Amino acid sequence: MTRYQNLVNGKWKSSEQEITIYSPINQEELGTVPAMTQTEADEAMQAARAALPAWRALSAIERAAYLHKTAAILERDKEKIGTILAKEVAKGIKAAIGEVVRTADLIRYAAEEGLRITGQAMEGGGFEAASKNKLAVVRREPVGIVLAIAPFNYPVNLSASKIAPALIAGNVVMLKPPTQGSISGLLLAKAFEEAGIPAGVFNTITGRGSEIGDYIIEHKEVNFINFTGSTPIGERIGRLAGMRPIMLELGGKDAALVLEDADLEHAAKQIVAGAFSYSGQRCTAIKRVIVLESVADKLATLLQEEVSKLTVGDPFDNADITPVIDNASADFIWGLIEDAQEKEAQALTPIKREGNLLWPVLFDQVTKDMKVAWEEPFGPVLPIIRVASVEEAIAFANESEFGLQSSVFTNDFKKAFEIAEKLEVGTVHINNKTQRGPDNFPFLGVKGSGAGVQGIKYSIEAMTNVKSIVFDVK
Amino acid sequence: MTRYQNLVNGKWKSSEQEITIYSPINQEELGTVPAMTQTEADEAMQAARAALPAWRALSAIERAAYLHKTAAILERDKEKIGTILAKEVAKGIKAAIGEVVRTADLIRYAAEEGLRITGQAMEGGGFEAASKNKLAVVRREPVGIVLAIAPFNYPVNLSASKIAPALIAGNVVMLKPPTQGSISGLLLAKAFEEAGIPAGVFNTITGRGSEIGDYIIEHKEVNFINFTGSTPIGERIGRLAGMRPIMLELGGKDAALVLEDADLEHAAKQIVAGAFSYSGQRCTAIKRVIVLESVADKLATLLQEEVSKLTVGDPFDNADITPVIDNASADFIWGLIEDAQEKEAQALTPIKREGNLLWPVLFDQVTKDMKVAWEEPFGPVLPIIRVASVEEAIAFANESEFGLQSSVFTNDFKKAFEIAEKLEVGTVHINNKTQRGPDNFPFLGVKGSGAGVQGIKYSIEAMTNVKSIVFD
Amino acid sequence: MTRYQNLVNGKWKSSEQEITIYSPINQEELGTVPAMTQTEADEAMQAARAALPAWRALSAIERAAYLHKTAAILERDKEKIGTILAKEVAKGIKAAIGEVVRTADLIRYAAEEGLRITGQAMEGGGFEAASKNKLAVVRREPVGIVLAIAPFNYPVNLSASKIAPALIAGNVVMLKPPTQGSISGLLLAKAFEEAGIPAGVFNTITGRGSEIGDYIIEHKEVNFINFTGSTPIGERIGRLAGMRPIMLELGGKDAALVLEDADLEHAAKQIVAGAFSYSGQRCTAIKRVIVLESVADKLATLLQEEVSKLTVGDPFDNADITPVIDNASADFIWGLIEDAQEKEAQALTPIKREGNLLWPVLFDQVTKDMKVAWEEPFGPVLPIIRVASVEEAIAFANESEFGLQSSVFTNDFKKAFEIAEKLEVGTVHINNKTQRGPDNFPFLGVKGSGAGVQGIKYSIEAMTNVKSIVFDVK
Amino acid sequence: MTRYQNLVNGKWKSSEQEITIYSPINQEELGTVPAMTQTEADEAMQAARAALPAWRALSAIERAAYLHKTAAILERDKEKIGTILAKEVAKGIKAAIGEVVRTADLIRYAAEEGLRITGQAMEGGGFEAASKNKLAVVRREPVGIVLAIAPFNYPVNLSASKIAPALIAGNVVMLKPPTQGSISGLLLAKAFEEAGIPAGVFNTITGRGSEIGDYIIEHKEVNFINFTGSTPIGERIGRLAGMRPIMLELGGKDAALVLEDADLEHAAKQIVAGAFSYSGQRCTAIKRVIVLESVADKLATLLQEEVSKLTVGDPFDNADITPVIDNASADFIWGLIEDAQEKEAQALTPIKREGNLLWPVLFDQVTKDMKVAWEEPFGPVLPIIRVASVEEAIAFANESEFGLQSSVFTNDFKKAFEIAEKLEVGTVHINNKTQRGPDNFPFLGVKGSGAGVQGIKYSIEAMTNVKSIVFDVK
Numbered sequence A, C, D: 001m002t003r004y005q006n007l008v009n010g011k012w013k014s015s016e017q018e019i020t021i022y023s024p025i026n027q028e029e030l031g032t033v034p035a036m037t038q039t040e041a042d043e044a045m046q047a048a049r050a051a052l053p054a055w056r057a058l059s060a061i062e063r064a065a066y067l068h069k070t071a072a073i074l075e076r077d078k079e080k081i082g083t084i085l086a087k088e089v090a091k092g093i094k095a096a097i098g099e100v101v102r103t104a105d106l107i108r109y110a111a112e113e114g115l116r117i118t119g120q121a122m123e124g125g126g127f128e129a130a131s132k133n134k135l136a137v138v139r140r141e142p143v144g145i146v147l148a149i150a151p152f153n154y155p156v157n158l159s160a161s162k163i164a165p166a167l168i169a170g171n172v173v174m175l176k177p178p179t180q181g182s183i184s185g186l187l188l189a190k191a192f193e194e195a196g197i198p199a200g201v202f203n204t205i206t207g208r209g210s211e212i213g214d215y216i217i218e219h220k221e222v223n224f225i226n227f228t229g230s231t232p233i234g235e236r237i238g239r240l241a242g243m244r245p246i247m248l249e250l251g252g253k254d255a256a257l258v259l260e261d262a263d264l265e266h267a268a269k270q271i272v273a274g275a276f277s278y279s280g281q282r283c284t285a286i287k288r289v290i291v292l293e294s295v296a297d298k299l300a301t302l303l304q305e306e307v308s309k310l311t312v313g314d315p316f317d318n319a320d321i322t323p324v325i326d327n328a329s330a331d332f333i334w335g336l337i338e339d340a341q342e343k344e345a346q347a348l349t350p351i352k353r354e355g356n357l358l359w360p361v362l363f364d365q366v367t368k369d370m371k372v373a374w375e376e377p378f379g380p381v382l383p384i385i386r387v388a389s390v391e392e393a394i395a396f397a398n399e400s401e402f403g404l405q406s407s408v409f410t411n412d413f414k415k416a417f418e419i420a421e422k423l424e425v426g427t428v429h430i431n432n433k434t435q436r437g438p439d440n441f442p443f444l445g446v447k448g449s450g451a452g453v454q455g456i457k458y459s460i461e462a463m464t465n466v467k468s469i470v471f472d473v474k
Numbered sequence B: 001m002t003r004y005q006n007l008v009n010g011k012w013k014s015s016e017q018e019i020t021i022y023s024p025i026n027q028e029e030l031g032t033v034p035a036m037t038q039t040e041a042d043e044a045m046q047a048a049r050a051a052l053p054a055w056r057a058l059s060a061i062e063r064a065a066y067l068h069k070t071a072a073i074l075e076r077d078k079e080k081i082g083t084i085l086a087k088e089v090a091k092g093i094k095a096a097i098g099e100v101v102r103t104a105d106l107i108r109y110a111a112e113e114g115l116r117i118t119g120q121a122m123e124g125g126g127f128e129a130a131s132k133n134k135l136a137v138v139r140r141e142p143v144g145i146v147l148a149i150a151p152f153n154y155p156v157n158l159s160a161s162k163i164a165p166a167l168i169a170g171n172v173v174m175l176k177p178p179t180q181g182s183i184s185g186l187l188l189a190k191a192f193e194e195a196g197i198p199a200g201v202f203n204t205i206t207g208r209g210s211e212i213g214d215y216i217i218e219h220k221e222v223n224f225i226n227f228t229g230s231t232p233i234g235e236r237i238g239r240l241a242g243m244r245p246i247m248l249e250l251g252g253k254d255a256a257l258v259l260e261d262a263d264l265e266h267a268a269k270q271i272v273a274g275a276f277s278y279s280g281q282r283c284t285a286i287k288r289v290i291v292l293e294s295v296a297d298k299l300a301t302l303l304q305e306e307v308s309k310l311t312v313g314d315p316f317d318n319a320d321i322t323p324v325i326d327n328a329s330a331d332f333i334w335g336l337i338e339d340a341q342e343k344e345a346q347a348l349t350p351i352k353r354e355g356n357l358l359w360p361v362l363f364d365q366v367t368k369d370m371k372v373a374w375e376e377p378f379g380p381v382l383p384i385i386r387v388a389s390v391e392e393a394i395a396f397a398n399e400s401e402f403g404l405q406s407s408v409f410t411n412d413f414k415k416a417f418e419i420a421e422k423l424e425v426g427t428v429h430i431n432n433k434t435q436r437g438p439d440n441f442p443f444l445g446v447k448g449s450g451a452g453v454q455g456i457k458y459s460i461e462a463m464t465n466v467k468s469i470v471f472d
């Protein structure tokens, strides 16, 4: 019964109350995290504010040295961290060891990306002849206190993808780990503390969302909100932030537009590997298949073979399909499956449940009226939608409320490029599954998938402030 | 009795109701502008949404051609537009003609800068050996319908600085000209219509702010709100926009920090020219002087002479101090002046009201308890605040709720650079007054002066969406 | 008999000796240009060196104003300059006025692009913690005097492409027009002087190569040599320039790699349009077809139909095949054609020669021993080369000594991209012919095809010097 | 008595003959170096040509892993390499060890900088409406084989500054160590080979310039020459290169312009620290004090006491003034001192000579007639030159045939910026000594002082070719 604590002003501290964390696999007690109160969150913010000056008065290479030390420690304990993460959010054990390794690679790259940030030296001579002697030296300064709110699916990766870009840029970071996955956020904080990050530069906040979860967002000391989660909470954040800068990475129903000339075997393998990784619990996952009618049958057969080869089971057996995060999540996904079945959709895959453990349901004949065609299941369902033309596929893709990513499988790259130009998404992948990619590529969503563009350089550039210094050079 | 109309879907439209516009100089009826209803706003947004795809299907050079045409036409009617915008916001006629010519120059520069927006080609390898031979082609696409809300002080320049950067990027623009200054917004729309801009690409919205003011901000067709105005209204817009991208350019109490080793004559001339241009109704004006005690008396004397050389009167006489925009504005300035003089501030110039026409009040011995050290007047009042140290000056400057711009007057540029690093503003000017400047320069506020970075390149970038395309 | 004059120090200057220029189409006469002596070249160089300080002192928008005025005057006298151009180099009057118009467009774009050249404000904190208070403001200064040597092909376009990028960046320009199309260069100077560009900012130096050819290149006043022409002369310039910066745009042997999946009709049309534009006298024209065996016969038939549809005549009938520039050119192309004939290459189109007027020769079954497979003809002859594999095509394309551009005609863009990365050229066009393209695109050659990157942005950057100013900010 | 060998194709080689290398400190023999022949140089070039298309095919992060391994090994053996370097080139032991760790974190920065080189995605629609659908994907490809020639000055630092920016860019490198400092080049090769660098990727050439000196520069395998030496040999190289790209870092005569408002104590300290570091044997050292007559006497006294407190002796006692590299250098420097004192220059510090070890000479009343005012001594001689105005100082500064770096000591920064923009140098330091600076900063000479822009990013981009791939998106 481990009693994990909160990093606050460089000291590990606990709270009077604590939240118990149960495995989504078998409800094993993983430990407890403190249930902070509003005054505790307030004092963590005031520690951050006090640590900010000396942190941004450091040279970039020094902050990067701290970051590199953190990444080394994180890679050192990749199995300790990986096991706890694997039982905390019920993801495959190699998938959970893989997240820690990808995390360390991400913060190494962010440390090295954020010490190469170059300003501009602009002159007014090109705009007007009267300002020919004026020189603006434009650079970037930290926004201040960055508040990072991590999601459950990648509690170590999508938390470090906010902490490391903010830290190298000179900001202090306040981390809010998810409700499920908070022990992993505290373990990330342990790696940061072991590195030697100065007191107050990185603080953690754990608690009930009904007590401090709004209080930390509307706090006056917070200068930037970096949030990954679902679109409802993201829309609430966008209004609770006022006009303070935010980065929201919300839900996505990513389409796989498959056309007649698509190499269907590769398309099916990629579509299934994208759709069912972490049992569908990914924002950047293939969440619908929009296939043309002429190849829809063969694509459905290949998709069925791929989805039948998926091993459902328990995280430590390295199952492709592990239990979903909550019972409420399984109930919501089950409702989507029920609604599809009631409207005469062809479930060409066993449709059975075992509590949290759902089965990789591949549906066909999915129409506009089924909720599985629009709602993000965040679980193991994959709709197949048949369209008559490319225009119908593009209209179906752009009918979604989400614009995160999309895949276009073709053989004609000129055709794929103009479809990609037509798709109202942030990223289009040509003949590949949709993903966050190398975390040096831009990662952004549109209409409902969030605000701002991520990617390591884009995240460093987003939690900074432009400061122009203008003088005369005669 | 000119009945100005609204550009919607290329055609000119009027409404049943009408707002009447009176000069802040002598209250003459300048004309009337339509008071659109929420349904008419909706139709303007639908015209915009239908015009968007053919506008971004146009090549960049083809849209820049329209922008250059509009700038040439607008410079053609520099005197006609200038007189109307002079008597509409009580701006000096040589400054109102200058606003139009600088507007034309901004549209030219925006066209030619939005021609050259180049994307990236990232390679994946270098972050992972697995993602080697994945190529991301990163480019920018228009956000969609850009809603621009212009301020009264520059109805033509600060509406074009939202329209032209958005239009060149591929967006369609829905302009919301201010209440005082709506006629100049339609005079700017006249140029866009004359220069063959396609239907629905540029539309104008005029009406009472209690009928369509929130209806247009909250509309779902709006994809970007570009707003210039006051901090209360901007803070309201910030929440009303949701997670839609916004550009807010709110107020600012720009400080003029003067040190002991500083050319006081140059500093005084710059401080007064900045502070009292358009009689203080500028977001980027010197709105407070923070001088060190040793040079405070010499600077006060020099500042007083500079203020005394100011001409107060009528815009068409090219006065330095024309009347403020409204009576409520003058009452608010007069309240600040009263609060200051009822607290023993040394008024160094003759406090004198004549209706809207206020007088260039220069105050001294201003402390933190007077509400003129903190509140942005938007009128002809300059507080001198004396501090004992450079640290005291920086703390006083950073105590403001605004962070737009600031000036540091000294002779040690290394000292000025250090102070500029410490100042929580967007732009620091060393040994010059604050200004929006060369409009290619970044223009931004922090802390409460706004959200986002303006300046033409930054404006074009802000109203676009990154569109990555990854392949093998 | 029009006695054209050299623009020197704002004044029109003539010489004791004048070179006479005759029409390549009928040897008529067009006028004379001053054959300057070396002292005259010195006075032009000194005029430029004295004009340099006040031209640099100008604001960028003020320098751009002259450029825009020149562009307007050029677009005004489009038909006059065009007629003299089509007379000078036998180009085709609708393709000669097009050169004048594309030249004014280039000048406008160069002015507007040079307005926006922004510097860097680099900090040392990312590299070391001891330099964290040092700021480098890095901007670009003019090199000084730029010597632009134009070719006969495009004597106002490939001349403006050196003058305008140089002028907008603050340099003063020496223009050495081609010995043949010099009258067109003096017309360009007429336009620049009419715009009102200051005295000594743009001068022209005509003459005989044996007197002032190496003389102006070796002058110590010249700070940059921008030369486009033939590869041997380019090598001589590369030696003669010492360590002074140069930009050489030399010959090319651009290949059209045609694979089996290619759309052969599009390939044939693109290849013929690229290859026979201006009678093959372009460095960026297609100059050899490298085609796989399977589709080679169908491609050759399509290519033959395209070639035997080209108009051969005089420039004022707007012929696609107008006479080559001089008699030595026609003799060299005829020699290549003969060498191909004796080694049993299949002439797919008639082999005719009416003096300078050559007929377009499509040669099939061309092998590595015929010299038309390697040498740049600068004449209307295109060899088709058959290869058995994609690797054979890449080996044959990279066997050339030239590296300017190439086309890959394919249907698989992934394959086309792989081949493009394998081709040793500056630019690869996928399913299109080679061109200088939009002039904002980079234009460069590799191994034997030149030195430096052209394109308006790259040309502006090439003829400037980085000037870094480093100071403490704390 | 160690016999060092040449890294060729992953193997160590002696040739038949060996150049024996002696310590410039006394004469102590420290080893021999293979006197390679033209044939062996050819085999090394061919090994590099064969290793190229596997190093290119590697990922940027893998090539960077090799670079980081080399940097780690280099810091592991900093004292052994440093001691050998200090006796090899006669610099203080703490300064020879300090260019081994400065070299290692030059190598780290080079790798981290080279693995985020981004390309462009240019569209043609801004230039013309006919090319709106053309997209250029502009990326950078390795130049090929890089020839790096190091100077004796920094045989490790000024060698890695060419190797690492090359190797990270994907192109293989051949290193020619200086004749005096060959041991250090082979010691750096030892670290590169120990790191695991693939065979043929990093080779080393030693021998006699009369045998293999022009032979390697003129070799057709070489695609880029990166040379830092003296202006004569750089003039030869710029000619022998042809049109092959080169980077030349030649000599300098950096001036410290001191005006009347200047802080004279700071100027006096900075000037001596910059001028006499490594016995004045740096290209970027201060070699000229140009001071206004009002403050010239006070400056001269401060400078004299600054120079007098320097220590002259042995490198292992960490003398500030260690002996110059060879006897020819001491003869030339003594000739400069001679010419100065015959023409009635006022020696402010004693002039001495102990064969190779000279004493630092502060010369006042230096005029444009003494050779010490114009020639680069590469020895501990600093001439003070008095001028009557700032315009006279700028005229004297620009009178030099060198354009590398310059210092302006002022108190008015607007004045210092004015003068800096007037100065014909590559870098101007305001109120600080000239230096190569943080190596991320641009480093260049703009006169007969060099060709090309160095600095880690600038040298990475110099030894690459732009490759544009243009296709239609439509």
Ligand SMILES: O=C[C@H](O)COP(=O)(O)O
Binding pocket: A151, A153, A154, A157, A281, A282, A283, A284, A285, A435, A436, A437
């Ligand atoms: O929330 C899930 C993320 O958006 C999915 O991206 P990732 O699995 O590549 O980190």
Ligand SMILES: O=C[C@H](O)COP(=O)(O)O
Binding pocket: B153, B154, B281, B282, B283, B284, B285, B434, B435, B436, B437
């Ligand atoms: O309303 C505020 C404007 O941004 C001020 O413009 P300006 O500083 O150029 O005079």
Ligand SMILES: O=C[C@H](O)COP(=O)(O)O
Binding pocket: C151, C153, C154, C228, C249, C281, C282, C283, C284, C285, C435, C436, C437
């Ligand atoms: O000399 C010939 C030029 O390089 C060919 O290019 P261009 O005809 O497209 O301008």
Ligand SMILES: O=C[C@H](O)COP(=O)(O)O
Binding pocket: D153, D154, D157, D158, D161, D282, D283, D284, D285, D436, D437
């Ligand atoms: O030019 C050479 C500089 O004097 C020293 O170079 P470095 O930065 O490698 O030590």
